[PDB]
Motif scaffolding. Sequence first.
Motif, PDB file in Angstrom:
ATOM      1  N   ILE A  33       9.929  28.972 -55.059  1.00 31.36           N
ATOM      2  CA  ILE A  33      10.384  27.350 -55.324  1.00 31.36           C
ATOM      3  C   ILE A  33       9.639  26.689 -54.478  1.00 31.36           C
ATOM      4  CG2 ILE A  33      12.503  27.413 -54.167  1.00 31.36           C
ATOM      5  CD1 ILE A  33      13.774  25.782 -56.872  1.00 31.36           C
ATOM      6  N   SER A  35       8.413  22.804 -52.281  1.00 27.52           N
ATOM      7  CA  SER A  35       8.652  21.709 -51.784  1.00 27.52           C
ATOM      8  C   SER A  35       8.487  20.532 -53.106  1.00 27.52           C
ATOM      9  CB  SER A  35       7.912  21.113 -50.663  1.00 27.52           C
ATOM     10  OG  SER A  35       6.408  20.974 -50.994  1.00 27.52           O
ATOM     11  N   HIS A  38       3.676  15.604 -56.041  1.00 28.32           N
ATOM     12  CA  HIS A  38       3.250  14.683 -57.069  1.00 28.32           C
ATOM     13  C   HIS A  38       1.817  14.436 -57.297  1.00 28.32           C
ATOM     14  CE1 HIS A  38       3.326  11.920 -53.402  1.00 28.32           C
ATOM     15  NE2 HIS A  38       2.087  11.496 -54.052  1.00 28.32           N
ATOM     16  N   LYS A  43      -4.537   7.873 -60.089  1.00 31.24           N
ATOM     17  CA  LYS A  43      -4.977   8.924 -61.233  1.00 31.24           C
ATOM     18  C   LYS A  43      -3.914   9.625 -62.189  1.00 31.24           C
ATOM     19  CE  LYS A  43      -4.039  12.540 -59.173  1.00 31.24           C
ATOM     20  NZ  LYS A  43      -5.131  12.888 -58.352  1.00 31.24           N
TER      21      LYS A  43
ATOM     22  N   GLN B   8      -6.935  25.742 -54.925  1.00 30.16           N
ATOM     23  CA  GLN B   8      -5.873  25.480 -53.973  1.00 30.16           C
ATOM     24  C   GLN B   8      -6.266  25.422 -52.469  1.00 30.16           C
ATOM     25  OE1 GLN B   8      -2.665  28.499 -53.326  1.00 30.16           O
ATOM     26  NE2 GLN B   8      -1.846  27.560 -55.136  1.00 30.16           N
ATOM     27  N   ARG B  20      -7.483  15.366 -47.893  1.00 31.39           N
ATOM     28  CA  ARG B  20      -7.247  15.002 -49.239  1.00 31.39           C
ATOM     29  C   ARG B  20      -7.573  13.077 -49.258  1.00 31.39           C
ATOM     30  NH1 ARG B  20      -3.210  11.923 -50.660  1.00 31.39           N
ATOM     31  NH2 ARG B  20      -2.117  12.336 -52.421  1.00 31.39           N
ATOM     32  N   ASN B  24     -10.210  11.659 -52.171  1.00 35.20           N
ATOM     33  CA  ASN B  24      -9.945  10.175 -52.806  1.00 35.20           C
ATOM     34  C   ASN B  24     -10.841   9.267 -52.436  1.00 35.20           C
ATOM     35  OD1 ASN B  24      -8.048  10.912 -54.549  1.00 35.20           O
ATOM     36  ND2 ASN B  24      -6.283  10.487 -53.250  1.00 35.20           N
ATOM     37  N   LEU B  33      -7.324  15.472 -60.852  1.00 36.47           N
ATOM     38  CA  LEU B  33      -6.065  15.376 -60.305  1.00 36.47           C
ATOM     39  C   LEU B  33      -6.391  15.977 -58.999  1.00 36.47           C
ATOM     40  CD1 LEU B  33      -3.477  16.112 -62.855  1.00 36.47           C
ATOM     41  CD2 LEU B  33      -4.735  13.715 -62.705  1.00 36.47           C
ATOM     42  N   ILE B  34      -5.452  15.414 -58.054  1.00 30.67           N
ATOM     43  CA  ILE B  34      -5.117  16.128 -56.578  1.00 30.67           C
ATOM     44  C   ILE B  34      -3.699  15.922 -56.329  1.00 30.67           C
ATOM     45  CG2 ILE B  34      -6.071  13.940 -55.411  1.00 30.67           C
ATOM     46  CD1 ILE B  34      -7.176  15.734 -53.254  1.00 30.67           C
ATOM     47  N   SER B  35      -2.917  16.898 -55.924  1.00 29.96           N
ATOM     48  CA  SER B  35      -1.613  16.755 -55.480  1.00 29.96           C
ATOM     49  C   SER B  35      -1.670  16.097 -54.086  1.00 29.96           C
ATOM     50  CB  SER B  35      -1.091  18.239 -55.609  1.00 29.96           C
ATOM     51  OG  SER B  35      -1.497  19.035 -54.602  1.00 29.96           O
ATOM     52  N   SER B  36      -0.213  15.750 -53.642  1.00 28.55           N
ATOM     53  CA  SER B  36       0.159  15.776 -52.343  1.00 28.55           C
ATOM     54  C   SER B  36       0.339  16.918 -51.719  1.00 28.55           C
ATOM     55  CB  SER B  36       1.359  14.890 -52.299  1.00 28.55           C
ATOM     56  OG  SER B  36       2.427  15.651 -53.209  1.00 28.55           O
ATOM     57  N   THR B  37       0.498  17.031 -50.419  1.00 32.69           N
ATOM     58  CA  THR B  37       0.447  18.442 -49.639  1.00 32.69           C
ATOM     59  C   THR B  37       1.992  19.125 -50.177  1.00 32.69           C
ATOM     60  OG1 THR B  37       1.653  17.625 -47.807  1.00 32.69           O
ATOM     61  CG2 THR B  37      -0.846  17.722 -47.602  1.00 32.69           C
ATOM     62  N   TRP B  38       2.047  20.367 -50.194  1.00 32.23           N
ATOM     63  CA  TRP B  38       3.426  21.015 -50.539  1.00 32.23           C
ATOM     64  C   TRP B  38       3.202  22.451 -49.974  1.00 32.23           C
ATOM     65  CZ3 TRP B  38       3.020  25.274 -53.912  1.00 32.23           C
ATOM     66  CH2 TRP B  38       1.727  25.486 -54.617  1.00 32.23           C
ATOM     67  N   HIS B  39       4.617  22.987 -50.084  1.00 32.90           N
ATOM     68  CA  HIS B  39       4.281  24.447 -49.569  1.00 32.90           C
ATOM     69  C   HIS B  39       5.440  25.321 -50.389  1.00 32.90           C
ATOM     70  CE1 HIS B  39       7.493  22.022 -47.185  1.00 32.90           C
ATOM     71  NE2 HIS B  39       8.464  23.290 -47.410  1.00 32.90           N
ATOM     72  N   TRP B  40       5.441  26.579 -50.486  1.00 33.91           N
ATOM     73  CA  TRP B  40       6.551  27.343 -51.059  1.00 33.91           C
ATOM     74  C   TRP B  40       7.789  27.549 -49.907  1.00 33.91           C
ATOM     75  CZ3 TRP B  40       6.177  27.795 -55.882  1.00 33.91           C
ATOM     76  CH2 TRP B  40       4.819  27.935 -56.225  1.00 33.91           C
ATOM     77  N   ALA B  41       8.888  27.060 -50.429  1.00 34.51           N
ATOM     78  CA  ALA B  41      10.135  26.550 -49.521  1.00 34.51           C
ATOM     79  C   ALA B  41      11.145  27.831 -49.745  1.00 34.51           C
ATOM     80  CB  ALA B  41      10.939  25.271 -50.316  1.00 34.51           C
ATOM     81  N   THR B  53      -3.258  21.048 -54.269  1.00 33.85           N
ATOM     82  CA  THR B  53      -4.079  21.651 -55.559  1.00 33.85           C
ATOM     83  C   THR B  53      -4.956  20.431 -56.155  1.00 33.85           C
ATOM     84  OG1 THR B  53      -3.627  22.135 -57.959  1.00 33.85           O
ATOM     85  CG2 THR B  53      -1.676  22.637 -56.179  1.00 33.85           C
TER      86      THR B  53
END
Lengths: 86, 87
Positions: A33, A35, A38, A43, B8, B20, B24, B33-41, B53
């Motif tokens: 799962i 974090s 968005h 865009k 990714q 990032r 942009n 599209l481009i995501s904000s930074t995230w990780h597997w929690a 991504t």
Amino acid sequence: SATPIVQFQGESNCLKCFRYRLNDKHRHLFDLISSTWHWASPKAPHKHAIVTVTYHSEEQRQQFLNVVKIPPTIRHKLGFMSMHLL
Amino acid sequence: SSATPIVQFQGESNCLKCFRYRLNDKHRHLFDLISSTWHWASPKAPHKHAIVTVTYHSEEQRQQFLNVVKIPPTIRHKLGFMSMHLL
């Protein structure tokens, strides 16, 4: 070699509260799962927070969907991502 | 088909946000599209680091992004797909 996923979308606090609940009661029912995240900036198709949940199989995914109550404030979408991204 | 081509990116999260902001700012017309930074929690994850991504309208679009954009020394990448309806 596609991994089953569910994306959950909503207000971040409700989404993190929902993440918390999954980790506390339903942990055997998913694999990873994320974090909250968005789609950026100018865009985005939406300005709501997102959580990605992945599964070891379609059977697990379906059992998660059967057993878990999804909050009516949270929306969800099923898909796949390449397994080697994990 | 109903599969969106993606890249990714992975690395230290300040590197990723720096990269990032560069995407942009200079390369916006080269991706969708481009995501904000995230990780597997969760006590659960595979890797250790943050992720960004990037989605594309086609594999040819992704091809051109990859010949044009210089990927910083501090960043690794994988190509993949995700479901289009998730976007």
